[PDB]
Design a protein around this ligand. Structure first.
Ligand SMILES: Nc1nc2c(ncn2[C@@H]2O[C@H](COP(=O)(O)OP(=O)(O)OP(=O)(O)O)[C@@H](O)[C@H]2O)c(=O)[nH]1
Length: 332
């Protein structure tokens, strides 16, 4: 009906449709925490090639791709199987995000499924006009040369189908956290992924002390190119003043940012989070990027955050200072 159709539309246009998609054991592992812990204003879809894994995964919608190829046992770190498996189910996937204004594709680069599928999804995402964003991590050195090699090649493909590509050099984590088994190191990674994907999405969908227009988010990330996360947090007197400079100095931000084209700041904190602090954070990051960089900044209150202010930094437009290498990212 015409009268209804018009009401319907008003509804849908009231807010944006965000969809977070995680591929592979890594991606699925992230999708579950977001789902359980809850992710404001975002739909969660988890696609894997391993049925057993997809089973113990929590999400709004699950999808088993590449039925033929993989007997539901995984692509065995073979990217090609992932890419093929995806396209097979390129349809049931397109329906999973069919009406999204923005779609996030997250996973852990280096394996088969993730490295493979991640880009296929990115392409499907874009064909439907959705603002496309990926948030993937690079493999640990302990993982070997072959793993990294594939990761990088996947990271390449991904770049050709994304509006703003965010990568985390899992390796740099040891420059923060101490030495530890490849098992526990993964946990550290697990955290960071959640903080980045959640922190991003929620910078758009959660109500904070500052208005964050989707029109601006869309503008700044429509050409994000390559972007790098940066995390920090303080407890002291000048927590605001610290968390910022701590995130700005996070080894995860492996690149020079003097010529930052854009940035997405999401300052989080306790009930006593003030606009000055938020202001403080933004002011700092602002004087580091291009004097004319487009900056999107929010400031919410975290349910459980006694007296700690966490800060998420996602510097976009840094592809001009990084060089893809079969062994990883080099600071060109
Ligand atoms: N944070 C996190 N990283 C992990 C974990 N397990 C694997 N990864 C990372 O993600 C990369 C690939 O993800 P996998 O979990 O192997 O998933 P997949 O590649 O989709 O699976 P296959 O194609 O069958 O090999 C690995 O090289 C690791 O970097 C985990 O549980 N947590």
């Amino acid at each position: 009906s015409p009268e209804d159709k018009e009401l319907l539309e008003y509804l849908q246009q009231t807010k944006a449709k965000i969809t977070v998609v995680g591929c592979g054991g890594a991606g699925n592992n992230t999708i579950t925490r977001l789902k359980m812990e809850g992710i404001e204003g975002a739909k969660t879809v988890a696609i894997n090639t391993d049925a057993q894994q997809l089973i113990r995964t929590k999400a709004d919608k699950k999808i088993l791709i590449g039925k033929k190829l993989t007997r539901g046992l995984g692509a065995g770190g073979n990217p090609k199987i992932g890419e093929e498996a995806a396209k097979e189910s390129a349809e049931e996937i397109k329906a999973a995000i069919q009406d999204s204004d923005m779609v996030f594709i997250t996973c852990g680069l280096g394996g088969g499924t993730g490295t493979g599928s991640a880009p296929v999804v990115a392409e499907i995402s874009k064909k439907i006009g959705a603002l496309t964003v990926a948030v993937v991590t690079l493999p640990f050195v302990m993982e070997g040369k072959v793993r990294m090699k594939n990761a990088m090649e996947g990271l390449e493909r991904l770049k050709q189908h994304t509006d703003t590509l965010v990568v985390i050099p899992n390796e740099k984590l040891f420059e923060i956290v101490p030495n530890m088994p490849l098992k526990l190191a993964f946990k550290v990674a697990d955290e960071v992924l959640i903080n980045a994907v959640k922190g991003l999405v929620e910078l758009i969908t959660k109500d904070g002390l500052i208005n964050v227009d989707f029109a601006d988010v869309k503008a700044v990330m429509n050409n994000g190119g390559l972007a790098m996360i940066g995390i920090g947090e303080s407890d002291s007197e000048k927590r605001a003043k610290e968390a910022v400079s701590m995130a700005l100095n996070s080894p995860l931000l492996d690149v020079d940012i003097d010529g930052a084209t854009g940035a997405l700041i999401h300052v989080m904190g306790p009930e006593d989070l003030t606009l000055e602090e938020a202001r403080e954070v933004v002011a700092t990051v602002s004087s580091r990027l291009d004097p004319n960089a487009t900056i999107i900044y929010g400031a919410t209150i975290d349910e459980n955050l006694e007296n700690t202010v966490r800060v998420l930094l996602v510097i976009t437009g840094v592809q001009s200072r990084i060089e893809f290498t079969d062994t990883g990212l080099k600071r060109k």
